[PDB]
Design a protein around this ligand. Structure first.
Ligand SMILES: CC1(C)Cc2cccc(C(N)=O)c2O1
Length: 209
């Protein structure tokens, strides 16, 4: 059973701008997703300071980057607080509706796409290089769910039946045909040491054989 939702108009215009605007510094998407993972890890570690039972679903707090050249996917796995069905559907979009409006005002005032993180909408920068984004998350107070959208103005949410995660968020980027450079081991290295060198959690790059 899969439910299909319609993106808010402001968010839908933000993504379509991201995919269609000719912008060459697309490497900033990894900095935002890693920063999003660092925020999720800061939350779950902060809640465990007054409730250590929240870490029963996992004590390790790390970020994993798993490129796959066969499936043409780049995966970012973090063990943060996770996301609920209300967060995936509403809530998070309500928070981002103001950051989107302010972002589109700043692009016309001189700012570029690289400043998308300063508005709290840095996740949508994933569509700079991905034609389809799948999100698998697990929150301590909800079931495992699957978020998916190929832009177009709509997204789907369903209960995940795959391998359980315990807690955290898995972001799977189905990369575009011309963005396969972000699956190379030395390209992901350059981006991490240049953009996410000061993250307070271990960022492990999974190499392929
Ligand atoms: C930018 C934001 C925090 C809002 C939002 C809504 C739905 C999914 C995500 C995400 N997958 O990071 C998301 O990240």
């Amino acid at each position: 059973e899969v439910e299909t939702f319609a993106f808010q108009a402001e968010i839908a215009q933000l993504m379509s701008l991201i995919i269609n605007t000719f912008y060459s510094n697309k490497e900033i998407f990894l900095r935002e997703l890693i920063s999003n993972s660092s925020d999720a890890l800061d939350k779950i570690r902060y809640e465990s300071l007054t409730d250590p039972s929240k870490l029963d679903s996992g004590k390790e707090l790390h970020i994993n980057l798993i490129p796959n050249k066969q499936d043409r996917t780049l995966t970012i796995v973090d063990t943060g607080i996770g996301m609920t069905k209300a967060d995936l559907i509403n809530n998070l979009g309500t928070i981002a509706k103001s950051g989107t409006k302010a972002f589109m005002e700043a692009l016309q005032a001189g700012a570029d796409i690289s400043m998308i993180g300063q508005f709290g909408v840095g996740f949508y920068s994933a569509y700079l290089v991905a034609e389809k984004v799948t999100v698998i998350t697990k929150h301590n107070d909800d079931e495992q769910y699957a978020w998916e959208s190929s832009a177009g103005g709509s997204f789907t949410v369903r209960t995940d039946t795959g391998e359980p995660m315990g807690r955290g968020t898995k972001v799977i980027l189905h990369l575009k045909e011309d963005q396969t450079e972000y699956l190379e081991e030395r390209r992901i290295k350059e981006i991490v040491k240049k953009h996410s060198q000061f993250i307070g959690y271990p960022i492990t790059l999974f190499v392929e054989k």
